[PDB]
Design a protein around this nucleic acid. Structure first.
Lengths: 95, 96, 78, 99, 96, 95, 78, 90
DNA sequence: TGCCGAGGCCGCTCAATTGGTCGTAGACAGCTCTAGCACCGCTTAAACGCACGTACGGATTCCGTACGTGCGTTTAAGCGGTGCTAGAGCTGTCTACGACCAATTGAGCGGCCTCGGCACCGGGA
DNA sequence: TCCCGGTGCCGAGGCCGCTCAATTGGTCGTAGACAGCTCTAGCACCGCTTAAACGCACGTACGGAATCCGTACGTGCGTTTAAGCGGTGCTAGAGCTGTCTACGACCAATTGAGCGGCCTCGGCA
């Protein structure tokens, strides 16, 4: 029914399409662009959560607080290159 | 206009494969950080897609542009995995 | 009487979180006048992003943008 | 004893996530710099704006001290000294002070 | 589509009071460098004006936006000097 | 009496306006803005030429080559801040 | 082997312009490796800007865009 | 010599071996075969690479001077690669 | 000493300019009421300063070797050559796709409530 | 100091319902894909012509290790300070709505400055 659900994604293809169009990123936004961008964003969030969980299991904190996200971003090599210049509110430090 | 509910959805979905299988809720501050991460990465990919459109001199940012932008912003092994699962999602969506 | 606000134990705490063990005496003044230069730059760009919006209340969005102007992006404010 | 609480200090301040610099003195510095240095007057700071300024500035100083401890440890030293911070400021292309 | 002739013109205009032993012409490679500098600074100022428009939520990049973009891209004493001479040029242009 | 001549500038008011439009930096572009942008660009170029001559008058080569621009960009603190990340082609290193 | 093509005297040149006097014999290999890492990043981004152009030649503008992508803006190639 | 190389602008890494280096890197680590390099592209890439390594050596000599040393050594380059945001090797 | 590139002329041309309409983006004014400022006393924790002494920086010597320098020999980088063509780039058709729209509607937001995790705390080990 | 059983606070989390943004189908128009042609530039082998790399001998200057002294910096304590709170009181101004209008997009016409093409002669190899 909805574009997000149909694609097997969790992220809003409708909202992403609206942001793309109103963000003036180009005159037109091909219909495949929002679905793919939603999938990419969804998978990046999944990857960040995965890394936070793998670095968290030792700390075993049930939640995910900004410190865990900062650890995930600062530890994995690829994620570190992606978010090298990313400070995080109440980030703490990645051991 | 935040990606709060969607980040909740993806968190619950990723719990399924993880052996932890905990509801694993995200703290409000952590929720804001993840939301700002989604917005920052979306701005980065969409801006790179805009620059790629202007480079190739086209008025539309197709799937080619968002894919090349995801290959630029998100490089490496995690980048290949994410673009592959994104191609999976797009193929599933387009075949309907 | 401005940088004195960034008190000696404040630099001590900052640096302990950073990782150092023993801090010299010149480091206090030097980090005070490094933090002051960073704030000069970030607050110049943030006051620009404010005065452009025809405002005078520097918003945290203005700060996030002024930082993103120097590549340092903040997550958790907008 | 001269280093017995240094490890406790570093562990205690790396396990937490709070804001290290006291909030009102840093806010006072921000307002003082906005009026003294910039010369702009009657500028009011949103609370979240001072908060993001403080978080980013203290995270910048903390990364500066990481890089300073790296510089020291490279000089086969234990005490970060003004040359160490000057190197961590010149090498990592940070904002050098005026003078 | 290069700013070659215009850079020549600004060089001559500045040189009418600089070292006048000769017209200090700019070497071809130097011309390419200055052309790319103009393009880079124009893209930087225009991109900052775009971001400032999107911030203030306006479809047009007025003089306010190019001025704030010049105050962001070109900071310091030289930034004030350049924006002042730009306001001189703009006042001269509008009064005509 | 084109706009470039009218404004006292030498930089192309029309070309900058066209680039600002086709670049899609914004939907509309108030024709008072390209004038200011061209003036800022001309002033920057004049300033960089001024400081190249300022730092080179010792050599009296009577010509500007990319090394001259490199030294001008990377000597004075204001230009050094503007063009910190620049790497001029065939430039060399600042004296 | 290809990387070893950056001859030892070429690295000595690079470093003398950078203002070094005496170069320990291990700096040669570490410089070769950091140059290879730099070129791997810049060439991945340049190949991406090329593959997006649907063409098989990485042009000067592709490399310039890659470098802008990672921070170092080049002047004088287009 | 420091003077002759510092003041000149002529390229430093010999063009052909560096061209082989860039071609091999694109054809081996990246593994994209049948990639053709425009001459200007390899020239610009080499210019940027040598400029980045020259700045890396500037920071290496800074770190060396800082260690009360006259010979730059591998720990110095590792510091000038870690303190700066330069791309650490593989 | 001549040779070629910065600079100047030439003619086409394409991009800049102007004049006028329309509609629309936005400057402004007026209203709301959030929230930033100020302020005060009180708590109290945090800062300050001084005493003290340990340990760290640095100043010094000194030996080992890992550097530069200086040869000759070897090499492969450079260049000019032509030749070979993949493939970049420009054009011209068209159609598969996106904008736009109205109407449909249901996902998503805030508002309100809850209870289980956790900061805290005190105990015990 | 760790390691854990109660405790009270509060934020994750769930349910609702109102809303506005997402979705669908249809027109209609046009962007881009796709093919076809043109020839630029990359590439490749080749062979000289060097000039740079290389490998080794040498020896010296420098890294580092080892020691020694002074002092500066950490630790602790008592005294002083002001950060923070939170609670109130004040108003500036951020922001949101509505209005009205000056201005820019767009088209049609016009026009001349800027492009490459071509030339020349003085700065330079």
């Amino acid at each position: 029914k909805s574009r997000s659900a149909r694609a097997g994604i969790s992220f809003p293809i409708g909202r992403i399409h609206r942001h793309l169009r109103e963000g003036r990123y180009a005159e037109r936004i091909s219909s495949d662009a929002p679905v793919y961008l939603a999938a990419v964003l969804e998978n990046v969030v999944a990857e960040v959560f995965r890394e936070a969980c793998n670095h968290r299991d030792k700390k075993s904190q049930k939640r995910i607080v900004p410190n865990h996200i900062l650890t995930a971003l600062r530890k994995d090599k690829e994620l570190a290159t992606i978010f090298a210049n990313v400070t995080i509110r109440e980030g703490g430090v990645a051991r | 206009e935040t990606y709060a509910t969607y980040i909740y959805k993806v968190l619950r979905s990723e719990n399924i494969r993880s052996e932890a299988d905990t509801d694993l809720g995200i703290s409000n501050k952590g929720m804001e950080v993840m939301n700002s991460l989604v917005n920052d990465l979306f701005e980065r990919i969409a801006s790179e897609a805009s620059n790629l459109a202007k480079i190739s001199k086209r008025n539309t940012i197709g799937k080619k542009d968002i894919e090349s932008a995801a290959k630029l912003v998100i490089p490496g092994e995690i980048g290949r995995l994410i673009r592959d699962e994104a191609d999976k999602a797009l193929s599933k969506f387009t075949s309907s | 009487d401005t940088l004195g606000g960034i008190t000696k134990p404040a630099i001590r705490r900052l640096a302990r979180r950073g990782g150092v063990k023993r801090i010299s005496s010149t480091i206090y003044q030097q980090t005070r006048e490094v933090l002051k230069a960073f704030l000069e730059v970030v607050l110049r760009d943030s006051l620009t992003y404010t005065e452009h919006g025809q405002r005078k209340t520097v918003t945290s969005q203005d700060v996030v943008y002024a930082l993103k102007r120097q590549g340092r992006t903040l997550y958790g404010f907008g | 004893k001269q280093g017995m609480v240094a490890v406790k200090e570093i562990k205690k301040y790396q396990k937490s996530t709070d804001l290290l610099i006291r909030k009102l003195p840093f806010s006072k510095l921000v307002r003082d710099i906005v009026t003294s240095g910039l010369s702009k007057s009657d500028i009011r700071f949103q609370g979240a704006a001072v908060e993001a300024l403080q978080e980013s500035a203290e995270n910048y100083i903390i990364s500066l001290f990481v890089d300073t401890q790296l510089c020291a440890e490279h000089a086969k030293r234990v005490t970060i000294m003004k040359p160490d911070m000057e190197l961590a400021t010149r090498i990592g292309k940070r904002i050098e002070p005026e003078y």
